[PDB]
Write a protein that binds this DNA or RNA. Structure first.
Ligand SMILES: Nc1ncnc2c1ncn2[C@@H]1O[C@H](COP(=O)(O)OP(=O)(O)O)[C@@H](O)[C@H]1O
Ligand code: BEF
Ligand SMILES: [Mg+2]
Lengths: 86, 107, 95, 93, 617, 87, 98, 108, 93
DNA sequence: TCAGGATGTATATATCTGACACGTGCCTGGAGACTAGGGAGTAATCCCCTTGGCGGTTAAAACGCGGGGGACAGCGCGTACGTGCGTTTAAGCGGTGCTAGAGCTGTCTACGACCAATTGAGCGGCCTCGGCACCGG
DNA sequence: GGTGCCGAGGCCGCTCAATTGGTCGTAGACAGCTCTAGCACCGCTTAAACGCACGTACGCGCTGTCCCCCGCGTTTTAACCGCCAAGGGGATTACTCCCTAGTCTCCAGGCACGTGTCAGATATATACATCCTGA
């Protein structure tokens, strides 16, 4: 009924998850301070896309965020995404 | 008189008729020439055929019959020209090319 | 046992062949909704909206790790430091 | 309602280069996005080509110059020849 | 027509201008100059004294004029005569600015030493360190005359404009033909000089408005203002019909009015009537056959606009006429034809020396018949050419026959130029020829020791070549002067030469027909002017006439020369019979790719790709 | 004998060593290896032929034979290098 | 012995004067010959407006100055002060110009 | 029938009428709203004022009265907001911001 | 021929903030191209914004949303404030 | 440098299911024929400004010498990351029901395009004065 | 400090583009209703995360050597600006026709809907390829 304000969900991006991402990038050995640095980088990147997606969403006077909203938000950042329509 | 589509008249598989409508509805100019849709549909068909050939080859090398997004990623990123055309594009479920730096390898 | 580093190559060879998402979905989805509250409250996401965000975000991070790895090598190291992430983002023009 | 896509046309082209190879649903969705993206890259550049020259019509000449601007090097040469042959066969008959 | 209600306004300004026809302009007349003008060594010619009369008259009447004498009649001495006269009779010292071209600056200095030693002068030239040495002397004012160059009047305006100039003199005033000239802007604004004079042998070049710019500089508004620039001509007229020179109904009086307008201040003097003892100065134009290499190159450049190159194919040069002009001179100027022939013709590559230069260009072929003959009669010949790149080619061929030459070009050190003039003019000098550029060597130079002049190529305007001819046809020449203007048959050079011939008509209407000598006041001008119309018709086109035997007739000035001239002509014939190699190129070695003459693929199939290893196993 | 030396100029060498250092000073570097000059000539050459190729394409499309300033501006805007001050 | 500055202090002298200036740092004529030579490959018999060549030079120096700013950080990141050609290749590859 | 410009009735110094023409001529959409040019001209006027006063301040700091491309460059690059708006933009005759890395300068 | 620019309108704004300072010619053309750049940047996004929602008109609402999308942060808040103020004044008058 | 054992990689076979690919009805968008108009192709003219060359000064470039600052190799230390084992937590799954919001259809009306007159704002061209450089100190 | 001057600020005549005024019809707004996809729940395996500890490989600081880079001076060179010349094209203008928008009329390609079945995991059992250790 009453929505609970989510808090500290960035820590859900676990240390093994960041290591797996680093492995796919070819990284052989990871420092210990990388993990907090990566969580900051993901958060900054992911706020920019959400900001535009919500701007597209409220302009259409909708209450849901669609895949077009994300695809259009990404295309402005200069990074087109294939496989979700448009 | 029997109706013959513009795609057949131009010897294409892509819809010359639909491309014409998309140009008019897209607010690209006040007027659209007659040859513009034909030229553009031919170029779209060329690029589609160019990428599907390489993707089909990538599917064969992995002993597969159906194309999957991984195969499109392998086809695009291995070609020099297509990689530059799709430099800022990311493909869903495509992965990355197997590439390891030489210095990281054991001695 | 295995000499340190040989399992790392084995992990590198493995993850560069697969294509699935490398992050648990529920932790990521909760993170997305938390960020959206700061902008507008009582939003709602399509399933593909969150999947689109995850595909874009992990492609961003993997490509960033490729760049920060070269900066690590450029300084004659094999371990990536936080200073290597910052240099990569500076050259790209994100700082 | 009904949604338009290039799925059947992409599938037609596939059977001309790999008659036995198939296509999956997610891969077709990527190919549908690829065609839509490139179409708007050509059309947008041809749109401002006419504006720079104070024209009010986009012609096959504007399309060809836009192709030369966007496609890289040797890939553009084959696209230009593919397009000119189509407009030639279309005009003659 | 209203010709009358235009001169009346002129009569106003002379009146108002004088206060601070011909007679109102010349209010004061002083016939005292006939006396012995002192502090001199030589003696003036009789007419030069009359020129001094016309000069001091401008001083008394506060006028600015043009000493537009002919190009050898002692214009330097007349100006020196005025300076000494003012320092004595008027007793005014003044600073006396003088502007000269760089190559003339040594000559002007020397004239003051032997014609007015008591005059203290500074030759303002050199590196900036040297030029700041003069500043203490300039501020004190101990000097009487200052000689500079057009460049230092612009570079050093901040210290030269400070001095108030009692009299300004500009030599070879052709530089001011352009009104937007940077020299004119600096000179009239920054520099103050009430009494300005010009010296020139060609008062107006190809265009009529250029003469106005000289007059506008001399008399800014009193002559006639720039803003109110209403004209007698009111329009330039230049079409193949020479008998008409204006938008009028075959009217001669309109030209006759201009002669009256600018009569008061201009002094032209002809060489024939003033100084008759000089020899005739006969002029000749001799054509040249095109070599096989030139003929193929000239054909494609004119047709396609491209230079033929090796397969290492064609190059597209840019200014078509300029390239055609270079081909007619020598086909080795492009350095692509030279290098290819450096290898194929058989000897060492790169820089090329030998009889190929002898045979490469038709003009060089003709020179090697002429120059050894002129060596025999001990004539010294001075040779002009337009492009400096041609001189280097010309310089190597001169070493092959071992001629003794000097080369005064542009981009030769200013200090060295004075010496080069001295050595060539030395009596008993061992040098035979003296390479010059038209622009740097064509100005005021005394090369009197040379008797014949070779003009390798013509300029776009003819007065440039007339200056070159008169470097030898000056006071102090005793030998007959012959001008040999080389040309190429069936080439652009005839169009250039004919176009130049057309520009020679405008000045003949305005300056030559005026006869501004103050003695021909009689109606001979109209006798002269009407005689210009009929001789246009009598011209007949001439082509393809090298005139193999006539060329030695054209050099020779006496029959005894033929006796000399008929020896070596046959000796070359007998010597060449031993080894039969065509004197010209004559298609001999054109087997080069020049005469041999006369990625991108399809779509969807052609794309060449590399095998890719998608397997990853 | 001086004709051979003028052609061996290779006007890419017209971008002199001191000129490249002046760019490097404005970029704020303090000490330059001797192999930069050859490397940075290639970098400039690659950059120019990308922009020139697009500028010529705009010119050729318009039936002109003269590359105008707008052609250069339009080419740069296509590479995302917008330039202000040339209309 | 004549007075000689220590190495580096003259190179650092640009701070007071030669980085606050704004003029073009490449000579006009050598650059213009280079521009025409490159254009020969794409089209023959081409002409350039005077302001067209200035625009190319304006964008070219802004590009090279901006590249040396990134090259200088790749050198410092490797614990040295001398820029080397491997630094330019690292800077350009990160930007995506490889 | 008295004429009053749309710029004046909106309290602007930018040409609402001309901006309305540019929208209809640029093929941005089939129709243009009445308030769209007024809103767009107001935004363009604001951005112009922001740069102009910032460039004007840099002009005084050099004890000069005129604005030159150097002053526009200093204004834009010093303000982190305008800098992000004009990240991809090159200003002719602008120069660069004076900046030296810490390691390079001597430090005893 | 007559060539239009924003020179006079920029100069009017300049005398509002700095009544005494002037502006050079090159700095004036730089400002002129800046206005053109921002104009077509906002107009281009608003055009694409209206196409997404299948509208066929460009209203102040699209212009407002385009300002948020383009301008960063604190610039967008003030630009939206100015635009809203101008529209209400214009409507009332 | 070769041998052994352990772990992991790569291999051939059933089988299985969920998605690819096909066939069908049908509706809406594309093709065919017409008319009216204006965008642009084409011709002709004017003259700007582009190109190639020389002339003559002088500042920048080039060449060489010479010294020392800095890059690089090497070595020793020690810390922090990788490997593995064992414990703990929460994601992924498969349901299930709720309902809210997006989508659709139908009217209705106000707003923006179109057109036609009319005049003044904005542009080009001109005088004129001062901000800024610069020549010296 | 002072003199100088080129570039900017200011004024005027002349259009042509913005304003005013009507008219129309269609896009956009609103209401009503449907139904589907997103939100929330539950319980359950169980895979992934967490945590601990050991050793070891590597980051890092130091030192020393040497040679490359900087700085300076002398000579040389070519950019620069000034100047000559000619003509290729970049603009205009005017004419006119043919191509495109627009309309109505057919009409058939393509979309949604079901349907059948097979390509590609997934799991089993197995001989080889890779490391780590010893020698
Ligand atoms: N009175 C004279 N006595 C000796 N030589 C003279 C005399 N007058 C003129 N000359 C010669 O005439 C030549 C031309 O002098 P100059 O003033 O340069 O006339 P221009 O400018 O027409 O050549 C000089 O070489 C000079 O030696
Ligand atoms: F008239 Be001389 F040639 F100065
Ligand atoms: Mg003389």
């Amino acid at each position: 009924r009453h929505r609970k304000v989510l808090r500290d969900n960035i820590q859900g991006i676990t240390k093994p998850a960041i290591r797996r991402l680093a492995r796919r990038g070819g990284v052989k050995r990871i420092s210990g301070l990388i993990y907090e640095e990566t969580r900051g980088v993901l958060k900054v990147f992911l706020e920019n896309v959400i900001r535009d997606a919500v701007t597209y969403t409220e302009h259409a006077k909708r209450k849901t965020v669609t895949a077009m909203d994300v695809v259009y938000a990404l295309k402005r950042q200069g990074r087109t995404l294939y496989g979700f329509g448009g | 008189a029997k109706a013959k589509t513009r795609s057949s008249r131009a010897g294409l598989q892509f819809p010359v008729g639909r491309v014409h409508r998309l140009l008019r509805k897209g607010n690209y100019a006040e007027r659209v020439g007659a040859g513009a849709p034909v030229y553009l549909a031919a170029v779209l068909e060329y690029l589609t055929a160019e990428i599907l050939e390489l993707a089909g080859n990538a599917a064969r090398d992995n002993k597969k019959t159906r194309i999957i997004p991984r195969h499109l990623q392998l086809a695009v990123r291995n070609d020099e020209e297509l990689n530059k055309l799709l430099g800022r594009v990311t493909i869903a479920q495509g992965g990355v090319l197997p590439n390891i730096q030489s210095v990281l390898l054991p001695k | 046992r295995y000499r340190p580093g040989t399992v790392a190559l084995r992990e590198i060879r493995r993850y560069q062949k697969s294509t699935e998402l490398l992050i648990r979905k529920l932790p990521f989805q909760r993170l997305v909704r938390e960020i959206a509250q700061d902008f507008k409250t009582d939003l709602r996401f399509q399933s593909s909206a969150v999947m689109a965000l995850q595909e874009a975000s992990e492609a961003y991070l993997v490509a960033l790790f490729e760049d920060t790895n070269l900066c690590a090598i450029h300084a004659k190291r094999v371990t990536i430091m936080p200073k290597d992430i910052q240099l990569a983002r500076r050259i790209r023009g994100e700082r | 309602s009904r949604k338009e896509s290039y799925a059947i046309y992409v599938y037609k082209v596939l059977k001309q280069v790999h008659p036995d190879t198939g296509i999956s649903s997610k891969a077709m969705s990527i190919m549908n996005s690829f065609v839509n993206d490139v179409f708007e890259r050509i059309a947008g550049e041809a749109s401002r080509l006419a504006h720079y020259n104070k024209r009010s019509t986009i012609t096959s000449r504007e399309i060809q110059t836009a192709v030369r601007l966007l496609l890289p090097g040797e890939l553009a040469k084959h696209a230009v020849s593919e397009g000119t042959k189509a407009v030639t066969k279309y005009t003659s008959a | 027509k209203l010709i009358d209600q235009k001169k009346d306004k002129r009569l106003a300004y002379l009146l108002q201008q004088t206060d601070e026809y011909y007679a109102v302009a010349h209010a004061v007349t002083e016939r005292v100059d006939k006396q012995s003008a002192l502090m001199v060594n030589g003696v003036l010619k009789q007419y030069q004294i009359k020129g001094l009369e016309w000069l001091v008259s401008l001083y008394n009447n506060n006028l600015n004029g043009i000493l537009a004498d002919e190009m050898g009649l002692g214009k330097t001495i007349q100006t020196i005569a005025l300076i000494t006269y003012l320092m004595e009779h008027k007793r005014i010292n003044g600073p006396f600015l003088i502007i000269v071209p760089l190559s003339t600056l040594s000559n002007w200095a020397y004239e003051f030493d032997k014609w007015a030693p008591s005059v203290v002068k500074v030759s303002y030239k050199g590196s900036p360190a040297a030029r700041r040495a003069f500043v203490p002397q300039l501020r004190s004012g101990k000097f009487n005359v200052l000689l500079t160059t057009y460049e230092y009047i612009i570079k050093d305006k901040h210290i030269l404009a400070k001095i108030r100039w009692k009299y300004m003199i500009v030599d070879e005033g052709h530089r001011m033909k352009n009104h937007h000239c940077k020299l004119t802007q600096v000179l009239n604004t920054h520099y103050v000089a009430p009494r300005r004079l010009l010296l020139t042998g060609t008062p107006l070049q190809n265009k009529l408005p250029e003469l106005w710019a000289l007059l506008n500089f001399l008399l800014p508004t009193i002559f006639k203002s720039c803003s109110t620039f209403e004209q007698w001509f009111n329009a330039p007229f230049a079409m193949t019909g020479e008998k008409v020179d204006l938008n009028e109904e075959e009217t001669i009086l309109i030209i006759r009015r201009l002669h009256k307008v600018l009569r008061p201040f201009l002094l032209r003097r002809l060489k024939k009537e003033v100084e008759a003892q000089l020899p005739e100065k006969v002029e000749y134009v001799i054509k040249c056959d095109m070599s096989a290499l030139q003929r193929v190159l000239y054909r494609h450049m004119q047709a396609k606009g491209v230079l033929l190159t090796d397969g290492s194919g064609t190059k597209t040069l840019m200014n078509t006429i300029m390239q055609l002009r270079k081909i007619c001179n020598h086909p080795y100027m492009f350095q692509h034809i030279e290098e290819s022939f450096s290898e194929h013709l058989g000897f060492t590559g790169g820089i090329v020396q030998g009889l190929d230069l002898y045979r490469a260009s038709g003009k060089f072929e003709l020179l090697d018949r002429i120059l050894p003959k002129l060596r025999a009669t001990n004539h010294k010949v001075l040779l002009f050419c337009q492009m400096t790149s041609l001189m280097t080619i010309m310089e190597d061929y001169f070493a092959y026959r071992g001629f003794k030459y000097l080369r005064l070009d542009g981009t030769t050190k200013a200090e060295d130029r004075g010496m080069l003039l001295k050595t060539f003019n030395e009596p008993g000098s061992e040098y035979f020829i003296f390479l010059l550029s038209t622009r740097a060597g064509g100005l005021g130079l005394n090369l009197q020791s040379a008797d014949t002049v070779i003009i390798f190529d013509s300029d776009w305007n003819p007065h440039q070549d007339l200056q070159a001819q008169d470097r030898a046809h000056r006071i102090g020449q005793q030998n007959e002067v012959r001008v040999l203007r080389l040309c190429t048959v069936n080439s652009v050079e005839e169009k250039i030469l004919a176009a130049a011939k057309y520009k020679l008509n405008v000045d003949q209407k305005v300056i030559q027909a005026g006869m501004f000598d103050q003695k021909s006041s009689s109606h001979e001008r109209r006798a002269f002017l009407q005689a210009i119309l009929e001789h246009e018709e009598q011209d007949e086109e001439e082509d393809e006439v090298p005139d193999d035997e006539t060329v030695n007739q054209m050099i020779a000035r006496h029959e005894e020369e033929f006796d000399l001239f008929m020896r070596m002509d046959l000796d070359r014939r007998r010597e060449e019979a031993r080894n039969p190699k065509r004197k010209p190129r004559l298609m001999e070695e054109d087997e080069l790719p020049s005469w041999i003459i006369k990625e991108k693929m399809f779509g969807r199939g052609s794309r060449h790709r590399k095998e890719v290893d998608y397997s990853d196993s």
